Design a protein around this nucleic acid. Structure first.
Length: 261
DNA sequence: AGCGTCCAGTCTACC
DNA sequence: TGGTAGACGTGGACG
């Protein structure tokens, strides 16, 4: 999940779970996902504490507790949060003093759950670039840095180091909206296009958050809705969609609108 | 469920 | 450079 999906989970927890003691904990005995601590230790630790606030940066979320260390989640490809089994794919589970349950699942096992004294000072959050939703580069700045990069525009957007939060489909959507080929070099962008990408990134990510990442509420005219179709049968507003790879990720774009020099 | 194949955010080996 | 080609477990969609 990309920024919208995580931001939705953060808001949901900030709304239903703050100020309640953790009465019961269950940590999946998953050597790969539960990173740097035994599910047992991890359990004993947070037991009895209270969530003081839910924080986020990029595709990362952590729970600030009334006392460290704090549990953090790097979603990966299939990470997800649930409030209300323990589901089969649950890796982190807690029942609060009011019967409310919170669970982090990962049906694919590509996520990372850690228990760090300060997630903000260490990987992966420490190397994260400014957040797309919390620290949006001003129009001028955005471009200014777009210049200093001799990299393809998309893989540039998929780099958590540069900017954090954007994912494969959010990248495609914004480039499409701003009518910019994914392979156009960063530095070779016009201060006109740079202001165009800047504006779509904002429209796309906000609306996405605004709808709690519920893809079905996504503007009908977003390429997103047809990026699932197979090559040769994928279209948007009559225009044809092409599937090329960039940054090692299948990239959907429309040659008739997204061109390059 | 039962088949088989393909598509789907890190993180490292390499030209 | 930065470009890439693969690896990593495994569910879900589909011929």
């Amino acid at each position: 999940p990309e920024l919208p999906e995580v931001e939705a989970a953060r808001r949901a927890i900030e709304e239903n779970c703050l100020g309640k003691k953790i009465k019961r904990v269950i940590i999946a005995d998953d050597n790969k996902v539960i990173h740097g601590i035994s599910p047992s230790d991890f359990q004993t630790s947070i037991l009895g504490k209270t969530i003081i606030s839910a924080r986020r940066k990029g595709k990362n979320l952590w729970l600030e507790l009334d006392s460290p260390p704090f549990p953090s989640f790097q979603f990966g490809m299939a990470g997800a949060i649930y409030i209300k089994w323990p589901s089969k794919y649950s890796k982190f589970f807690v029942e609060l003093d009011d019967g409310l349950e919170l669970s982090f699942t990962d049906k694919r096992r590509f996520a990372k759950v850690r228990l760090l004294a300060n997630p903000t000072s260490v990987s992966p959050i420490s190397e994260l670039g400014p957040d797309a939703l919390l620290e949006p580069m001003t129009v001028d700045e955005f471009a200014e840095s777009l210049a200093k990069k001799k990299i393809t525009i998309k893989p540039l957007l998929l780099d958590q180091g540069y900017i954090s939060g954007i994912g494969n489909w959010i990248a495609d959507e914004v480039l499409y909206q701003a009518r910019i080929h994914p392979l156009q070099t960063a530095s070779s962008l016009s201060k006109e296009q740079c202001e165009a990408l800047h504006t779509s990134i904002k429209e796309v990510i906000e609306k996405a958050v605004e709808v709690d990442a519920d893809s079905s509420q996504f503007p009908s005219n977003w390429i997103f809705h047809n990026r699932e179709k197979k090559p040769g049968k994928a279209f948007v507003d009559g225009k044809k969609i092409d599937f090329i790879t960039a940054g090692g990720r299948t990239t959907a774009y429309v040659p008739e609108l997204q061109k390059l020099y």
